[PDB]
Amino acid sequence: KSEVAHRFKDLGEENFKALVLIAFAQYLQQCPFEDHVKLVNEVTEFAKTCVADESAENCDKSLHTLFGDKLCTVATLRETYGEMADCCAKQEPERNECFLQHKDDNPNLPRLVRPEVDVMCTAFHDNEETFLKKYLYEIARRHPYFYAPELLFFAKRYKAAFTECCQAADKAACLLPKLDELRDEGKASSAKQRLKCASLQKFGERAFKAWAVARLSQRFPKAEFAEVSKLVTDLTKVHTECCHGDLLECADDRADLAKYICENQDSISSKLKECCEKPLLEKSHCIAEVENDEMPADLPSLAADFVESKDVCKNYAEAKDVFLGMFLYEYARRHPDYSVVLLLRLAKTYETTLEKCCAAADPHECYAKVFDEFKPLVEEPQNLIKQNCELFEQLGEYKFQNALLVRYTKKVPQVSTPTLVEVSRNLGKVGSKCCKHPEAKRMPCAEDYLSVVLNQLCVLHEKTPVSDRVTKCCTESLVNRRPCFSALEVDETYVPKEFNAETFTFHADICTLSEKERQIKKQTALVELVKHKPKATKEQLKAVMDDFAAFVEKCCKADDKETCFAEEGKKLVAASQAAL
Template sequence: MIAVRILLPPPPASALKQPAAMEWRAAVFFVFLLNIAESRMLHRHEFGIASTLDSSQCSTEKNMLGLATITFAQFVPGATLQEINKMTNDVLTAIKKPTSDEQHGGCLENQVLYRQPQPLHHNVYNCPVVSEKVLWDSSCGFGSYKLFLLFPNGNALLLVLSNLIRCANKDMSVFLDEICHEKELSEKHGYSNCCSQSGEARHQCLLAHKKTASASVLPFSFPEAAESCKAYKENREMFMNRVIYEVSRRYRFMYAPAILSLAAQYDKTVPVCCEAENMEECLQTKRASIAKELKEGSMLNEHVCAVLRKFGSRNLQAITLIKMSQKFPKANFTEIEKLVLDVAHIHEECCLGNAMECLQDGKLGQVKDMERSRSNHKAMKKSKEKIMSYICSQQDILSSKIAECCKLPTLELGYCIIHAENDDKPEGLSPSLDGVLGDRNYGQLSSEEKIMFMARFLYEYSRSHTKFAVSVILRVAKTYQEIMEKCSQSENSAVCQNNGEKELQKHIQESQALAKQSCALHQKLGDYYFQKVFLIAYTRKIPQLTSAELIDLTRKMVSIASTCCQLSEENWSACGEAAADLFIGHLCLRHEANPLNPGIGHCCNSSYSNRRPCITSLVMDESYVPPPFSADKFTLNKDLCQAQGQALQTMKQELLINLVKQKPDMTEEQHEAVTADFSGFLEKCCQDQEQEDCFAKEGPKLISRTRAALGV
């Protein structure tokens, strides 16, 4: 990230004599360019809130090989390790270190160089070296440098700013150039169309390929323990490079800092386990933990990127604003805005596949997900390091709950802060929106003022309701904004607003009622029968999903109930909504890749905050036409008697799914009758000494009775 401070002298007398129109056009262009530069260099949002970010070139330089490998493996997952290494070597050769007169030993992050005035020229990165006094501490494109410029006229300044913007984006384009430069590789993996484009269009095209590119890549599995130990001892660098390559090509949306963090964990684990007596058990235990973190972390990162891509950065900022306000309810609005801006920017860079920026800015980490998966904390700890340090430096104004956390070592600090309680709400929070927001003359606000008004509403409402689910608060805010828009047209705006605020409660009541109903049902039925209820419901909603997909989806629902319903009742809604948001997000990704039905499409695309209520309200896909009946869909043999536990449950669930797909409008009475008939059939044949003969004889009879009962 680049920070620029400009000190402009008074304009020369000659400049004052320019025609008014020319002067106006120059001024507008200057302001426009400066705004672009600041948005990139200072990470300021449209309201000018300064960022807390401080990028580190050193962290990037140390991990250049890993970052390049991650970038290429994620963009071209079908490429071999040899192909990835060739592209990596090409790029690392192109990204040369500064020449002797520009190099000052080690990372330049903390070094300061003062140069005498000299003509404007470009360094080896083709980035500008300014013609006046320059104070810098890094090379263009790969670090944070501060330029204090003093120019006799604005033209040189415009040129420098233009070049700075270009160079700030250079580190990503060099990777995309390399992918497209290898014509044989781009044609082999189907990227020719993307490579025929340029700039942002090419970048977006290659990003789109990441969603579909790795169908041929086999699931990740670690090599045998003895083989791993031998390879590690022979060549540690080559071994770890392959680990990063294999992980990155399979987890294409996982953020680079998380991959590097997990790789570092594994790098420390292997030599220890290889010397242990129980070598295989030692490695197996650690690998299982890493594999779990990879799967969950990748799902979370992909979900965030999908939300950002479909609903935009403002939606992501709103989510982050709610979480920060709930975590730190005593912090003022300005402080929360700074944190929100930084976290949203990190996600944007990581989701663009920009591993360099993701690592540099990603030192602040994935704080948006503070309340997310506890098991994912290790993969995130490095990327949260700097923001946690910043939070500790500001704990007097942020939170009273983290004092003990801030005494801990770095490795324990992040985990402690993330899982610390939300701070106590400050005294005197007004229950009235008038007390919170003051005069709500919404109709007279400008577009930007309306955005800030709603941001302030989210902040105040979230810090007053720290137990509410993020998605519920988003729904409340959406309704509140609609009320304000409607009432701004009313003759009596105040009365209209007060009456409309009663509508806000419906979102809270709906979520709490659903959570209470689900927990009561889970407690009554237990895991298996609870899943059965949802299997029937979701097969009706989405019959286009395969049996395996439906079973996996409903198992996640069981897991949510098992986890959330153990909490106190006031936490049921927030826990359930957060978990549902994640699995619904992946259902929507599934729909995006291969459309399911119009109902799911509407729910996934119309409104982020309303996705869960929308899908909950679906009953049956009216566009679905059941296939012609086929007895082959109902496999009845002695395997049903021999299977046990999870395997038996899965076989029964597959039969149930096929039954519902055949008759989506099956009544409860029909279902009970068919189930009772099947149970009697299974008991009879499994007790028969000639099981195979029994299934062969009685199976067709059962199918005939079932068809008659259902009318299919």
């Protein structure tokens, strides 16, 4: 039998063209469009001829082996410059990896450009433009890991948009505010994902199970332990693939799944009616995270004292894996009000401890209310979301979200100025999209979201390696990430302590060079870090700065581009470090 045409024989053809492009274009990610597309055109071909006939010569390729051996070819030797030190070696296994499966990450390479003001409205005489070319863009750029089928789901929702409102609104208004929102949602999942791989095989594959047995049980909390373990065992497989390189199996798989999940509906989690009256595609992004859990649970199931007031320390605990699984899951069930990332810590203070004392010198009290020394590691969140959600509350949406900069730029003052200001504001954006939301529903979002961002931080910067600390809180644990960065004072380690850096204040009539405070502030904020990186930290001082660099606007007119550039440099560096 073959692989090629067989994949062709489920996900149809558009979505075969539709994968094999993004596939080939996360992969090599700098080579121009047509090179990539000729090569698709050809895969796309061929497939049809093992469609005709399995038995035809060389169908017998193991999928990759085609790509591998029709990729290096004229994609690559037209692509001759110096980072992919070719990787088609002794026709191997060790192809996918060494280079074809090495995706430069966040910050990959050229990028600045895009579409613009009026013209991108272009479902007239090509969707090769926009619709198609939301992959040499919305998937070459900064997303070599982005989850295939979800791009096919986020493809229609670039298409469908155009496919109504170029219309009466000149595309103007009735269009591009579905091109505001759904750009953060491109970043969101593409970033809500690098995690799910980072769990997967930049960290042990075993972890993920515990991730998802924690999670699918937080939403399907009557799903018997049987059935979460044919949803998280079935989801690893998917996610592993979309991570390990080979998508296609993926996209087929989340219906080789959803057409189990959603034929079984009632034995699993009631609330997946809606998205089962939804064309495949959108099934897997209702069920995918917009899944209002069916709290509260299975049961009364009164209490969880099988893990507790008993004597089966080991006796009923010679299944390592499933014992923990049934802690996790059953603990998971009654706690939509605690974040997975937390509960995963309670699932390592069972596991350790119960091993601390299933062994020696009885008796039971060792594990006697672990429930009552867990409780440190259940207070710090419940608490932290105070000096998350108050410094923000009555003290600033987009004003002092640049507090968490001051915090981070201090305690960890060697990550790259951007790579602060991507995070600094991003993990900023928890204050907004979660405090204004409170209850239980608060924390599950907000240790978790924070948890994603710290990962952006980690995955971002291996590339150049900086703060041995950041090295430490990334590596040492996944599960202990967000009391790590947190549990870090000002690393007085510093010096270099750069003085006086005038590839500094580019001024340049920024004031209406640039618009939308998202663009205005970001610079005004991009001032912050480098106004401390000289002088690591100071008390009151440092806001007599960002107004002495908020005149950065109002000396910017009447014959400018040299107004605020002589002026500042005296009056913002003169105003700097050690005296003022």
